Write a protein that binds this DNA or RNA. Sequence first.
RNA 1: UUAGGCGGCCACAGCGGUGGGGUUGCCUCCCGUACCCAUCCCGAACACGGAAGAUAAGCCCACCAGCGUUCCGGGGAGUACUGGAGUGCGCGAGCCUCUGGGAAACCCGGUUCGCCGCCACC
RNA 2: AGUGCAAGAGCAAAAGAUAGCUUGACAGUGUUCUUCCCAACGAGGAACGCUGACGCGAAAGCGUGGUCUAGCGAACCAAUU
RNA 3: CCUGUCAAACUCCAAACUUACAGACGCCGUUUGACGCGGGGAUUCCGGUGCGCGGGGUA
Lengths: 95, 154, 140, 186, 156
Amino acid sequence: PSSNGPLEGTRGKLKNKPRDRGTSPPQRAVEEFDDGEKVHLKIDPSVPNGRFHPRFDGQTGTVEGKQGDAYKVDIVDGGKEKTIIVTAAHLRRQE
Amino acid sequence: MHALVQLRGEVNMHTDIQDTLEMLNIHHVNHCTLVPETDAYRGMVAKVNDFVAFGEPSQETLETVLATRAEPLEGDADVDDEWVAEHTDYDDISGLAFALLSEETTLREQGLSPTLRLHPPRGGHDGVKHPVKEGGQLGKHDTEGIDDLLEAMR
Amino acid sequence: FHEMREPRIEKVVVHMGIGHANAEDILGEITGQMPVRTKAKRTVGEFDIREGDPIGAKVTLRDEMAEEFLQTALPLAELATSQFDDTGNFSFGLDVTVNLVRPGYRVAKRDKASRSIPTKHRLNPADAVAFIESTYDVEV
Amino acid sequence: ATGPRYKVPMRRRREARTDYHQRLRLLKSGKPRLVARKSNKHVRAQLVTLGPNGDDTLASAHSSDLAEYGWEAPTGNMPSAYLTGLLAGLRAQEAGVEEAVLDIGLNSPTPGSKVFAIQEGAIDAGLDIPHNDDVLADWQRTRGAHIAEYDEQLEEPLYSGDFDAADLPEHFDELRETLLDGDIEL
Amino acid sequence: KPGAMYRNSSKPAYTRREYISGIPGKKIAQFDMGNNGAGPTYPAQVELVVEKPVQIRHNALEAARVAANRYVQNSGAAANYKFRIRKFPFHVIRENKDGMRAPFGKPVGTAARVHGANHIFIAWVNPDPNVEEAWRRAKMKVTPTINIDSSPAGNA
RNA sequence: UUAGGCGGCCACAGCGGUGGGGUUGCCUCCCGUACCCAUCCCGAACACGGAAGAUAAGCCCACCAGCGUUCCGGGGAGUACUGGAGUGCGCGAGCCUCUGGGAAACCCGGUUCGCCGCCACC
RNA sequence: AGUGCAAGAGCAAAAGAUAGCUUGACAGUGUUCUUCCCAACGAGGAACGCUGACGCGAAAGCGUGGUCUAGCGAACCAAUU
RNA sequence: CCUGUCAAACUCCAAACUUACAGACGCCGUUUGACGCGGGGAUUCCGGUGCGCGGGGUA
Ligand SMILES: [Cl-]
Ligand SMILES: [Cl-]
Ligand SMILES: [Mg+2]
Ligand SMILES: [Mg+2]
Ligand SMILES: [Mg+2]
Ligand SMILES: [Mg+2]
Ligand SMILES: [Mg+2]
Ligand SMILES: [Mg+2]
Ligand SMILES: [Mg+2]
Ligand SMILES: [Mg+2]
Ligand SMILES: [Mg+2]
Ligand code: NA
Ligand code: NA
Ligand code: NA
Ligand code: NA
Ligand code: NA
Ligand code: NA
């Protein structure tokens, strides 16, 4: 890479298809998860806050408590165990 | 149920392919195993497709091979009718063979090593550089095609 | 059907597009209510570089205040046709514009469930000339 | 509409009925919403909760089914609003609902407004709602005094036939009084 | 310089003029020749078909086209035929003209990418194929071997 | 749902167009400014008070595919591209065979003129 | 379109414009991610909390500077609270 | 309206394929103790080649 910021090489993954453009629905920004649930991490290009580092987009972790309204999801980067602070807006229920 | 025979060695073959063969209980050239025809197994042989010879053998042939190259989970013991009868659910080799073919049991389940360590093909095989459709010995075979190989390596 | 289809005057905007005012006074008497400043956009050569800047005033008259005004304005104008909107409006003159439309216009001006008026329910240049011409004067 | 790249608003935005930015802020509380809505002739008050396939209304009150309790006056005024609020508020309590936040939709937060009147009613019914007392009407106007005094400048009945000529903020008391004990559907 | 230096399609497509400056103008004079006033209303239609994907410098395009059309004057300056070269030199080409240090070359030309089997030239003629000859000389000045193909013409 | 309120999915719902519907559950337009409130000027809007009129807007109901969108048949196409294998071919660029996958444009014909939830309601 | 400045990205009853009001560009202390994929490493950065005090709003709520990714600096010594 | 062409820093589309998690089968581990945790000792940080995909370069 020519630079090493968090958004390096994120043009695709953090951009919306022309039609999904604009403010997202509030239903999923308010969804409630329970400790133990499996959730898919995917940043919503439309939602500014509650994001996590673009490198984890695609990960599927486990909800283990929360911090404020944001959730604390545990994942495994390669072989390293990591905890990720993320809001509902960027999480989906597995299955 | 297909008969799998490794015809190409490990040197230079992809590691993930080698592991697969290993998961199929074949760790040497000319070693053979019987595998059920399931989606999971199907995907496996496909990935192994270029270094093996497989096909559905005939009742007879399986019998000849079972008799000639089957072994207990441990030991020299010849697997003959008597052995089959005094150790398995069936009464004789034919009975075992049929059950295998109809995928009702497996060589392990009956206390037999999952591997039939065959002999080098008498008269030689068709080449390990081309597939069957090309006159080679690699890939899927005919029941008659697998039988010849298996019988040559009996 | 009619009654709710027949035209009506909705606001008459009287504005003096000066270039920098004392003019409000006359608009106040000519209409009958306070005028509003007219700020401008963009910086331009007519020493009009100031963005927020009084550069004229206007006055939007509704109901009687509008008629009682047109009952002298119109007479001071001759023109008609071509000088009419495609929506049945027209400006003459110091400017004096007359916005015309039919009974259910609020549907497009309210907050809740607002909706654009259907081309069919719009007012045509012709249907406009009729209404007005039919009120103390002549067309073309 | 124009092309594959065109962006069509969410239905309820097209219909100019839901303010989604406000809705999201509303849902933040995690409490039931006290939906205060009006019509040219009536006033509605619902207690909505979030649901898998959409909102769930656990209790509601309409200015029309107000008569069902002895209302004999118009239903698009302040006294009406308050009462519908209190009515829905009560049915709410019955439902086991204890607190809510006020959703006034696309209406304006004007002081002494009917939506705030609705809010006052729901509060008195016993519902716990984040509010501000001095944004509410001064009780008398809630009662309908502003209208009684307006008919004082009579000369012609403010009410076409309807009931009374000089109107009744008292009829208001009689009703509130009624709703505060027993009766069906409460 | 030799065609050997640029005739292969091994490099990435380089055509974004928004990121490339100083690109030499093309030597290709025209793309439409003959009676361009008329539309393809002819009996016969022959085409010059390139048989290998290659890059053809605007250099070769112009020499090949001239050699074909300049010859199609076996029919006259205002003869009855229309000649078309359908490809355009989009691919910008460089040269490293220090040694291999900072070797990203400087724009020196343009070339058109043609894949095997495309037709680079298409002429329209009445049963009067002098064009077939205008192409024996045309594929004479372009890198690939070529195939002279006739389309509407069962007049053999 | 003989017209309502809050929504979910966010064009299958958009754009355009036709027909039908109201002494009332109703929604509207509509009528009107003493009040709460309101316009840097206007009761336009916002807010409040109210029914003389209307179904012309909106809205609801029925329907039209010309445009846009979704999905499907047949054709393009097992074509383009591609994971695995080859002492197959080619001066080479590159191609071919076996094996596991598999498109886009476009054309023709269907589909789509929203679906679903909760509450309230001759 | 605009949103201070590269480029890419976000944004329409707004993240833009106008008006008004306000100083949350607040003190304290953390969690996590990043810096440094995996996988150890400082300063820096960010996200998300809590305690305290405040601003605005009817209220939910929003404000841990500017929509996001650049604008930064160890020990020793000095000056400052 | 017709007609001729393109894109590493274009995209209405869109693979093969790579990849997170889960279940199944396989293989493995529970005297050969896997997965993992803690600690001791290193070497190493001139690499090369084939094949696939590359970026530069006439090569
Ligand atoms: Cl993170
Ligand atoms: Cl409302
Ligand atoms: Mg990319
Ligand atoms: Mg043994
Ligand atoms: Mg021999
Ligand atoms: Mg051989
Ligand atoms: Mg009608
Ligand atoms: Mg921010
Ligand atoms: Mg020093
Ligand atoms: Mg100092
Ligand atoms: Mg990859
Ligand atoms: Na969105
Ligand atoms: Na040098
Ligand atoms: Na040649
Ligand atoms: Na001013
Ligand atoms: Na109507
Ligand atoms: Na740090």
